[PDB]
Design goal:
Chain lengths: ~400, ~100, ~120, ~500, ~110
């Protein structure tokens, strides 16, 4: 076959052989005869994009693209989906623009990502919340798309679950920082692990209000998904230190690794096609035609890259539009205005580092913490006894105390 | 089981039995009979009748966890009153006690 | 179950002709309708409308403000109240039963009169 | 201004130019004026998108108008317009495109419309059923995302009365074999369906269902516009009520309303904090507006309370609210309107309404059933179970008072030993429980066909295999899973059972 | 609405298979079906075929309907031409607006 790539000329723009990365095999084999056609384009514009991409397919008669731009806008992935629709080119994104997942794809559209579901992020976040055992909290979510999905998913996984999560009152903000509809509701929140859902600016305004309410005390925690995690470098001055949040990694698993992953999965899909029912289709003739009823020879490979495991990695998507094994990471914001790798999500586990929450400060100075102690002893006569926690609702029985 | 687990103040007994819970109360009875179990905790009526008929087992203790059996009813059904008030009227005219004694 | 249009040939112009149609072997208390499709002489047909025994009716939009038909169970018959009759009525009037069924369609037509003004 | 539009034919372009010129003559810009342009669709999509991008963005267009051509391609007009508008985050207006996948302001970051998609008319269902004593709906829905949205909307618009639909069974879009769904639907007391889906599947279900006589007396059907269309007004049994919109495929009125709204928004926005300019040329700039969300946000806040179509009021998700619909009866393959939808009110017309069947009444979607299948588990002292012999009955045994033992068959299983399949042999269960059973059966005057359960447990609450989702198994479980109504047996009143179910007053104490 | 077209008549000897074809002016013959009447001269109409798929009780297998819907020609067939078939053949259809009828078809045998 013939696999082509194209990039947005970021700081990582290098030679074609430099980004080729190919060796004797892909990871352990995959003997399909596929060459590398590496491209580049500094800027990316709709006419430029359509011409470049659909002449690139109409060039060497490619069989894939792992394009990822440096732009920050949903338009890149949306355009790419729209074009994979009308020419039937399977597309997977790895960085920057082709990284934010849409609400849903067209049924015949073959366009993928490496991102993670708002469901997956929400559940990983809630498991983080579980381990610390502060299970008394409320909610607040200003209006921003995906908010219904998240609130519904948490509201349905709270009760199917069997730990006893106390889900207090919830608040939505039509116009964040309004003082007429927002403040009148926000002030009545008697929670302890508040878990807001605002995009970026609503978030800044509500944090600024929260300081004005003094709610940002020393035990008043704040948990956020990847959406606020814009670029890990543009923090405002109203996020208190240590705002725990999950996101996608931006420090390990570089762009070339994702290029290698996409090459491997596309090559494996083609190899499976040829080995099973070899019917290798040719190119999509021309970019645009005159008029033709779309009819693929079959489901070419649109559902075929499920349960795909390569180099030990389990890169498999599905009809939902998500990767079965995301790469989400738990991140803090310590008193250095930096985002630190504290908690990777393994196969399924949670993988914390701080055996206990070392109670970081909020911003720099408020009423100091003067109500906590760290007591210690040894197991002894029937007055203190040791016991290993139950697998069910796996914290422990409800009579004991967290014993470390 | 749901009472004990939900009522964890003697969970020692709960996981003691959790590794020894049986299948059928009857099966528990004939298992106790052939010196396989030395006790049987259960609703009063069944074991009361079992001892009264076949007199080889004796009821220890007095009672606990008073309860009364009932009739299956999903939350949506038209048989709430036409059964409950039926039994309540039939509750007092000596029929239920007569049938039980029978 | 046999139809009969009463008015044989009353063709008085500038008046209110009343053709009455009744049936034998049954009554109107059923789930069906009635039909008075008109045939222009030596030509094709010309639908007039249709009525129901109990509440409602409906006609060809060509003729709306002129057709008013009623039905009586006591006399077991139904008749129109056409107003300001003109020379266009020089065409044979029929009275055919229909079946609701799944397709609107008339049962075999009635005897038919020769009303031509 | 230099507003842009994508039209189907030249009469449409002339109408658009006339409308924008009339808007200018009534009220116009101080210096920028209102220049306008319209282009035509191409059946190439990729090239049509190339054309609209190049020409429109090079034209410094400030608003984009897109109208659905009457040709049914269903992915022709709005599919490339909204995407490239959102690349520059510039809003678009919808004219005659009425699907609901676009109402989700997530991917099509810019989309308006003045045709409330088919999810909106689901509101008509409650707007009517508010006062009809209609309380049992087993509505069917297809797998189309339109059907998905209409479903979820109908469940969420009905919980204000805390009620619940019985069956919301669903099916694949546009199939040719739907008889199953139907004979399981008829084996329910409920006799109302609010099926609303694609026209082709609608005709399919009509054709496959009329064979089952469920279209007969006392079985109404509820259907919206698009499901009675093209190939559907044919197979329709009489009585099918139709739900349609007032102003159909009349492009002129919607063009007028859209251009009036755009002109008002631009004229008010001529004075503002900051107004930037569109990037020039489809190629080149790779950055968003500095003010595009301002134009969009002021576009949602548009109370254009004057027009040919009345007040064009817009809802929160960038669509049109405050619409007028119509309930129309299908009288003997001759469809005529039977109801009005002025919004939150109903004013039925003075007409002879007709249902399927042919009665002129209020057919009851409700019934008493009076079947009452019974289940119960064999402990020992309250139910004695004996395998009845090969004689067609249990036995005949007597008592001291000359009163013989009542005995009925019991279609219990035969899988007490694990692994053995339930032979479901008809044994004979009797005793105390059967006595209370027969007495209460005489009390309520029904019939029973009693049978046991396979597992043989009280069926507590637990978790499914290797998951945190909970469930109830066993005897209580078959009570919940609509398999029988009475399970009369010795069952303990406890907390977790009663927290979500209802019990009869106890008939004993232990 | 929409009219039909049967020019005036057709003439053929017994033993041939000739019949007029009713044509839908506007739209296609797929939704609201067609139906042929026979009306002996100087008499009332009577059905000859219904929905062009089945024949009423008493109608011989001589008549049969078929649909093309491409030219919208609601085809009728009287295969087995004889003498007694002299009458008027009227194609009829319907819609939510109106029921409309043919111009008639009287053949010469």
């Amino acid at each position: 076959l013939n696999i082509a790539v194209m990039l947005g000329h970021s700081h990582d723009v290098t030679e074609r052989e430099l980004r080729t990365l190919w060796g004797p095999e892909q990871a352990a084999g995959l003997p399909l005869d596929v060459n590398v056609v590496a491209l580049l384009m500094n800027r990316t514009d709709p006419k430029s994009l359509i011409t470049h991409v659909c002449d690139l397919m109409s060039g060497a008669r490619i069989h894939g693209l792992v394009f990822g731009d440096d732009t920050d806008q949903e338009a890149v992935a949306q355009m790419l989906d729209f074009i994979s629709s009308h020419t039937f080119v399977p597309i997977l994104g790895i960085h920057g623009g082709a990284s934010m997942i849409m609400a849903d794809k067209d049924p015949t559209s073959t366009f993928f990502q490496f991102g993670a579901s708002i469901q997956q992020q929400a559940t990983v976040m809630l498991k983080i919340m579980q381990d610390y055992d502060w299970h008394v909290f409320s909610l607040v979510t200003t209006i921003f798309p995906g908010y219904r999905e998240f609130i519904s998913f948490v509201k349905t996984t709270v009760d199917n679950s069997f730990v006893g999560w106390d889900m207090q009152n919830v608040i939505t903000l039509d116009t964040s920082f309004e003082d007429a509809k927002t403040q009148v509701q926000l002030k009545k929140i008697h929670s302890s692990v508040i878990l807001l859902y605002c995009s970026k600016d609503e978030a800044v305004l509500i944090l600024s209000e929260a300081r004005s309410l003094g709610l940002t005390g020393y035990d008043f925690f704040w948990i956020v998904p990847s959406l606020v995690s814009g670029n890990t470098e543009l923090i405002p001055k109203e996020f208190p230190s240590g705002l725990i949040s999950v996101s996608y990694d931006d420090w390990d698993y570089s762009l070339e690794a994702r290029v290698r992953d996409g090459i491997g999965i596309l090559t494996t899909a083609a190899s499976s096609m040829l080995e099973k029912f070899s019917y290798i289709p040719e190119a999509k003739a021309s970019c645009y035609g005159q008029m033709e009823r779309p009819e693929v020879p079959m489901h070419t490979l649109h559902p075929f890259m499920v349960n795909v495991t390569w180099d030990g990695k389990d890169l498999s998507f599905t009809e939902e539009g998500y990767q079965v094994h995301p790469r989400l990471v738990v991140i803090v914001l310590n008193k250095d205005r930096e985002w630190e790798k504290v908690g990777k999500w393994e196969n399924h586990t949670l993988s914390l580092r701080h055996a206990v929450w070392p109670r970081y400060k909020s911003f720099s100075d408020c009423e100091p913490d003067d109500n906590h102690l760290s007591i210690v002893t040894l197991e002894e006569a029937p007055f203190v006894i040791v016991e290993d926690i139950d697998p069910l609702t796996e914290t422990c029985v409800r009579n004991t105390v967290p014993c470390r | 089981d749901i009472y004990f687990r939900r009522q964890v103040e003697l969970s020692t007994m709960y996981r003691h039995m959790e590794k020894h819970n049986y299948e059928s109360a009857a099966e528990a009875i004939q298992a106790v009979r052939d010196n396989k179990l030395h006790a049987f905790i259960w609703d009063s009526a069944v074991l009361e009748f079992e001892a009264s008929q076949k007199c080889d087992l004796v009821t220890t203790g007095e009672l606990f966890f008073r309860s009364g059996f009932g009739i299956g009813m999903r939350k949506d059904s038209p048989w709430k009153q036409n059964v409950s008030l039926s039994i309540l009227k039939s509750h007092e005219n000596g029929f239920m006690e007569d049938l039980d004694k029978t | 179950l046999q139809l009969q249009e009463s008015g044989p040939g009353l063709v008085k112009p500038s008046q209110t002709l009343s053709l009455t149609c009744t049936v034998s072997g049954g009554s109107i208390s059923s789930s069906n309708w009635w039909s008075w499709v008109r045939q222009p002489p030596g030509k094709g047909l010309e639908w007039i409308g249709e009525i129901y025994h109990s509440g409602n009716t409906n006609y060809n939009p060509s003729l709306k403000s002129r057709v008013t038909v009623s039905v009586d169970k006591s006399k077991n018959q139904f008749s129109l109240k056409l107003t300001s009759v003109t020379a266009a009525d020089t065409a044979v009037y029929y009275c055919a039963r229909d079946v609701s069924g799944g397709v609107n369609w008339f049962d075999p037509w009635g005897q038919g009169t020769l009303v031509t003004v | 201004v230099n507003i842009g539009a994508v039209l189907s034919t030249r009469k449409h372009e002339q109408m658009f130019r006339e409308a924008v010129n009339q808007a200018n003559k009534r009220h116009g810009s101080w210096k920028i004026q209102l220049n306008a342009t319209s282009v035509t669709h191409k059946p190439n999509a990729i090239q049509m998108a190339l054309s609209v991008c190049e020409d429109l963005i090079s034209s410094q267009v400030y608003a984009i108008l897109v109208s659905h051509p009457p040709t049914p391609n269903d992915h022709f007009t709005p599919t490339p317009v909204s995407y490239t508008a959102g690349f520059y985050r510039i809003p678009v207006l919808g004219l005659t495109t009425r699907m609901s996948i676009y109402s989700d302001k997530s991917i099509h970051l810019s989309f308006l419309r003045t045709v409330p998609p088919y999810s909106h008319q689901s509101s008509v269902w409650f707007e009517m059923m508010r006062v009809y004593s209609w309380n049992h709906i087993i509505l069917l829905v297809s797998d189309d995302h339109e059907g998905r949205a209409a479903q979820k909307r109908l469940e969420t618009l009905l919980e204000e009365r805390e009620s619940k639909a019985e069956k919301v069974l669903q099916f694949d879009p546009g199939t040719k074999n739907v008889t199953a769904l139907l004979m399981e639907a008829k084996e329910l007391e409920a006799r109302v369906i609010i099926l609303s889906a694609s026209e082709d599947d609608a005709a399919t279900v009509y054709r496959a269902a009329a064979m089952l006589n469920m279209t007969g007396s006392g079985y109404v059907w509820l259907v919206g516009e698009r499901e009675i269309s093209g190939n559907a007004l044919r197979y329709a049994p009489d009585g099918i009520l139709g739900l349609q919109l007032i102003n159909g495929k009349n492009e002129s009125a919607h063009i007028s309303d859209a251009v009036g709204v755009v002109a008002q928004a631009v004229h008010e926005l001529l004075e503002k904090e900051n107004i930037t300019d569109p990037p020039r040329g489809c190629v080149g700039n790779t950055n968003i507006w500095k003010t595009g969300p301002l134009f969009k946000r002021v576009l949602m806040s548009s109370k254009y309370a004057d027009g040919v179509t009345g007040r064009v009021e817009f809802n929160e998700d960038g669509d049109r609210k405050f619409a007028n619909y119509s309930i129309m009866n299908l009288q003997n393959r001759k469809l005529v309107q039977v109801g009005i939808y002025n919004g939150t009110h109903v004013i039925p017309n003075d007409r002879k309404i007709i249902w399927p069947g042919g009665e002129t009444e209020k057919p009851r979607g409700y019934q008493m059933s009076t079947r009452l299948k019974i289940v119960t588990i064999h402990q020992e002292p309250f139910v004695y179970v004996k395998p009845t012999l090969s004689d067609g009955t249990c036995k005949e045994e007597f008592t001291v008072n000359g009163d013989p033992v009542k005995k009925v068959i019991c279609t219990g299983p035969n899988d007490t030993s694990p692994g053995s399949p339930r032979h479901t042999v008809p044994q004979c269960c009797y005793g105390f429980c059967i006595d209370l059973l027969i007495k209460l059966a005489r009390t309520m005057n029904f019939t029973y066909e009693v049978h046991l359960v396979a597992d043989g447990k009280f069926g507590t609450q637990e978790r499914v295999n290797n998951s945190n989702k909970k469930e109830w198994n066993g005897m209580m479980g078959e009570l919940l899973s609509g398999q029988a109504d009475m399970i009369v047996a010795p069952l303990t009143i406890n907390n977790e059972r009663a927290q979500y179910i209802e019990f009869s007053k106890p008939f004993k104490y232990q | 609405n929409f009219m039909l077209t049967q020019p005036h008549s057709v003439s053929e000897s017994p033993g041939k298979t000739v019949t007029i074809s009713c044509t839908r002016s506007s739209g296609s013959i797929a939704s609201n079906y067609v139906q042929w009447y026979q009306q002996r001269p100087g008499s009332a109409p009577t059905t000859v075929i219904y929905e062009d798929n089945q024949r009423p009780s008493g109608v011989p297998d001589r008549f049969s309907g078929s649909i093309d819907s491409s030219s919208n020609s609601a085809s009728l067939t009287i295969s087995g031409l004889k003498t007694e078939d002299e009458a008027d053949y009227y194609c009829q259809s319907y819609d939510s607006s109106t029921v409309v009828f043919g111009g008639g078809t009287k053949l010469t045998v």
